[PDB]
Subunit: 367 residues, 2 copies
């Protein structure tokens, strides 16, 4: 005996929410599956890779019996997205989970749960509530700049800094950096690094909750991010995030104000040549215009000249254009500023007249 009646939308939502905490195929195939647990009229779906764990309480209409088993993560995810009816019925027949919805019946072979661990929340520590939409926005404005190389433990993630009524998120890959800061309600100071994999689950949670605010708790070792129905717990990265403030310049010698669309389009034009091999654009900043230049030995050259408002010194300075383009994608204002010191110094990019968001791109050596 295990029987569950649940709306298909609920099952789909809870599976989706848990899905980015699953492990890969290798290193415990068991951890590449969801734990389904039915006990005492409660139905939980869990996933973990041992660094992030998610325990989702499923709000069902009927729950009887007792069961604890694992089902393969990929198949169950694909399956729930195509169940055709408003209601879904779950049961066991032999060693199979039987999933019935309308016209369709899936029978999915279960795995043992005896090595699937208990997922427990962070202990008492530092806690705050934040507006769900605000935190989502902050995460999305920085997460792209994190190192994708998991070996770079100290950059493969997003750094959280809390102060009195203030949260800042920072991410970097050593070539560029994104920073977001917003006023919130928070009592205590704290900071921690969460892995990129943990952060993608954070984003997944936020993109799939309708609740107005969420709770965060940090105990020195783990961070819980909780909604009404979903507990997510993440072990903090055991690495020291770089002293990133040393790459954020305190003054400028050159400032350029330029249309975000205008520069994006110019970057696209020069990438026709830059993508061929140089992976470089040289900015020649003059009083009223900036020329963007890219050269490929074997294919050709491009020069594109764009109108700008510029204060300070004329400057010739080179960048990876993809890194500049990534920033522009994440800025929402029509105009941006680019702030420079020297050909060898970082550039700060920010939205015009909007505080709280800033980007740093390191330059490349001039050809």
């Amino acid at each position: 005996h295990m029987k569950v009646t649940v709306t298909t939308l609920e099952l789909k939502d809870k599976i989706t929410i848990a899905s980015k905490a699953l492990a890969k195929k290798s290193v415990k195939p068991i951890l590449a599956g969801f734990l389904f647990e039915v006990k005492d009229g409660n139905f939980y779906i869990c996933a973990t890779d041992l660094e992030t764990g998610v325990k989702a309480t499923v709000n069902a209409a009927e729950i009887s019996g007792e069961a604890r088993f694992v089902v393969p993560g990929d198949v169950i995810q694909k399956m729930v997205k195509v169940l055709p009816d408003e209601i879904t019925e779950l049961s066991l027949e032999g060693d199979a989970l039987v999933i019935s919805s309308g016209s369709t019946v899936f029978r999915i072979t279960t795995m043992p749960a005896d090595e699937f661990p208990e997922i427990t929340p962070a202990e008492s520590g530092i806690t705050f509530e934040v507006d769900t939409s605000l935190l989502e926005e902050m995460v999305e404005k920085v997460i792209f700049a994190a190192a994708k190389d998991e070996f770079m433990r100290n950059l493969n993630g997003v750094f959280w800094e809390l102060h009195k009524n203030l949260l800042r998120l920072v991410a970097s890959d050593g070539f560029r950096l994104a920073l977001a800061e917003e006023q919130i309600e928070n009592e205590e100071e704290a900071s921690f690094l969460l892995s990129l994999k943990s952060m993608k689950e954070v984003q997944n949670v936020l993109d799939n909750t309708t609740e107005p605010t969420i709770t965060v708790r940090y105990d020195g070792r783990r961070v819980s991010l909780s909604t009404n129905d979903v507990e997510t717990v993440m072990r903090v990265v055991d690495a020291e995030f770089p002293d990133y403030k040393r790459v954020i310049p305190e003054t400028f010698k050159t400032k350029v104000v330029v249309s975000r669309k205008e520069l994006r389009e110019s970057l696209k034009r020069v990438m026709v040549i830059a993508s061929k091999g140089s992976e470089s654009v040289k900015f020649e900043i003059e009083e009223n215009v900036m020329r963007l230049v890219s050269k490929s030995p074997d294919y050709g050259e491009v020069v594109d000249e764009v109108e700008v408002q510029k204060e300070g010194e004329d400057l010739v300075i080179a960048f990876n254009p993809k890194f500049i383009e990534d920033v522009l994608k994440h800025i929402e204002t029509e105009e941006i500023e680019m702030n420079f010191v020297d050909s060898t110094s970082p550039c700060q990019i920010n939205p015009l007249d909007i505080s709280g968001y800033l980007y740093i791109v390191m330059p490349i050596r001039l050809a």
Copy 2:
């Protein structure tokens, strides 16, 4: 001296049109480029891979001088799609093509044209005009079923059959077949096979002309497809297209009428399991319903039951579901028919009550 002034839209259109006649990087890098030729106040852009050739006349505002050179195909294609101004100016500086448009200047290294061949049209033979949109539609309704394996010379293409006031196109890959037939104005009988690569250029031409009809001429060895400004010539495939009529059954024992959306959705559900390895769906056709069944040894089973109108015998029969799904994508009616003989015989799929279009899928062995 070579100078050309042309609208950017014109240059873009003619480059795009010629682009699918280019050869790959290997085997004459020269043939992976466009021929630009300026002579006597005419500007032509050409491309060939020695089986398909395209000669596009560019309608420019100003053309002076004389030049004949090749430019690399990928870069020029990317470049023209991002020129920012209504007008584009072309000239030579050193061994470079200089392309100036608004704010942007590209300088692209040219290659020698002395080994780029003359592209000439088919000789007198069989000729007809066809409505551009009609032929486009016919091509799109069949081309997906062609063999993608170039070694299968006799199936790697689309077969054209002309009769008095009638054109039929056929494509097959040995597992499935698509056929389209429409009334046109045509005097003589003829048939020929054009390669899949040639046919993709045909489609490219049709998708990029605004002219109401196009001309086709066949001389026994080559087929020209001509618009006002663009001559495309293709060498016919030296292979015998199979006697495909032997897989088109003349009668049915079972006919099923079913919603195209309904079956597409059912196929998607069973593919959750079929994509895991079996690549198979078993249809159990009964009086009022059809059950679709897929099984994976290691992951599970799915059964989906859909409402159908069925005449004739109950039947159990298996297919590759991707092949059924491909057909449905190309049918535009809300309802389709599936027509069967035996578990070992082809299935004919067609739109309900629409002549001129039909699909054949061969079954797979029952598990």
